[PDB]
């Protein structure tokens, strides 16, 4: 490996519309599972794409990483996966303690609400 980063001239390879949002994570105990299951998709020459299958709501990511069912992976920790097994190895490391990984969430996105209960996320 290579410890040492300070400094990305640009290194993201997203729709040029739709957004990213870091989450960290964390493993008090390797006990802790993700909780975060992967799939692939295909249909595309261009390039797959490794998005959630599932997401657990009893888990690291549940109780934190706002991560959730049907999205899509870019980078984790801020490495490039290329293949879905590695997404899951990489989630898979006896090493890595912050679980960082990267995720295409929808700016504005359509008005569609009308639910009374709390939940509304606003940009800044």
């Known amino acids: 490996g290579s410890s040492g980063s300070s ?5 993201e390879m997203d729709r040029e519309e739709l957004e990213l949002e870091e989450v960290d994570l ?4 390797s006990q802790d599972k993700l909780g ?4 692939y998709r295909t249909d595309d020459e261009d390039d797959i794409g490794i998005y959630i299958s599932e997401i657990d709501p009893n888990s690291i990511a549940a109780k934190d990483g706002r991560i959730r069912e049907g999205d899509r992976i870019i980078q984790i920790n801020g490495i490039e ?3 879905r097994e590695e ?3 990489l989630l898979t490391s006896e090493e890595n303690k912050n679980f960082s ?4 969430r929808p700016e504005l996105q359509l008005d569609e609400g009308w639910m009374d209960d709390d939940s509304g996320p606003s940009s800044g």
């Open 36 to 39: 975060l299951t992967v799939c």
């Open 7 to 11: 400094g990305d001239i640009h290194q």
């Open 26 to 29: 964390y493993r008090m105990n």
């Open 101 to 104: 990984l990267l995720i295409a």
């Open 81 to 83: 996966v290329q293949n």
């Open 87 to 89: 997404a899951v190895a």
